[PDB]
Design a protein around this ligand. Sequence first.
Ligand code: ATK
Length: 332
Amino acid sequence: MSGPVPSRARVYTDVNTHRPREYWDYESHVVEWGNQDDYQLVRKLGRGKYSEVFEAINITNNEKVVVKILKPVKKKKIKREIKILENLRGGPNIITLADIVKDPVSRTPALVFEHVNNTDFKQLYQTLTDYDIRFYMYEILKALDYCHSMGIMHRDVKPHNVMIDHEHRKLRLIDWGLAEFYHPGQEYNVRVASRYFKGPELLVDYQMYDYSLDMWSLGCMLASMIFRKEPFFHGHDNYDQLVRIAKVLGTEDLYDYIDKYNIELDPRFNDILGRHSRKRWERFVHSENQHLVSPEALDFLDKLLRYDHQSRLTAREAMEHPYFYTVVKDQA
Ligand SMILES: O=C(O)Cc1ccn(-c2cncc(-n3ncc4ccc(NC5CCCC5)cc43)n2)c1
């Protein structure tokens, strides 16, 4: 019919605009390799369609490390993750890229990260207490506010990509293989993030999104922690994914959302979105999650999970929510 309405990030809108071209132009980035003979695989940690991750050891100092062996994908796709990890290196709660080597066997680039004595999230989350959830969520806001202020969107926030060393209260945001630099006006691929954490802007096919996409994904994790239902929105596919959301936030705000951005809703939604009222977060409270739920917890979640990305809270604003007052404000 007509065209979608443009959009711009409310914050960090032109951070790359004013930075040295080399900073964001990863394509012309020239990788400097290290000595792969330096590391040895010790155990498989998991895989994916773009890589296989392992636990390794630096043979020269016995230091434990994690090696991500890539799979053919395009130099551009490779340089992008490398450029990003180096621009963020040192950032709060950002996994650290220790090295970059040429894997002889696979003949593809293998990245070496700092290793974190992680505790399976599927088990860790069942033991987390109210303070912990607030605490880790806060640590994730740091990395989120840092990468955002550095002009980068993660695009794949989820438990799986958050490493935690519980005894040491240490958290790191990993896997920036889908991370991209943010340029106002640009139209991105919506085929990013993982189903359960995909934002309505992705489910509705709106391309001019921004960092606010990570806030929704982050909202999805919060909900699954305080309610002890992981994942929270269990869609069967991308279309059903939106349906599940609709069934909680209600269909009215959803339609207010596409009307506003004059989005062309895929026909396949007509027959499945239905008509649902916005449910109250209390409907998800029970005798097993009550201790983890509070007004500040719901008010916060409420400000993270909204159709209009623009209305979502920015990581920086979120760090200011009463829900984090306690979080032993370092001070020292
Ligand atoms: O940054 C990256 O993408 C790789 C990357 C860089 C830092 N890591 C990293 C660092 N320390 C520990 C782990 N562990 N430890 C146990 C474990 C179990 C599973 C996984 N899954 C991996 C994360 C997604 C699937 C593979 C990691 C796991 N991973 C990973």
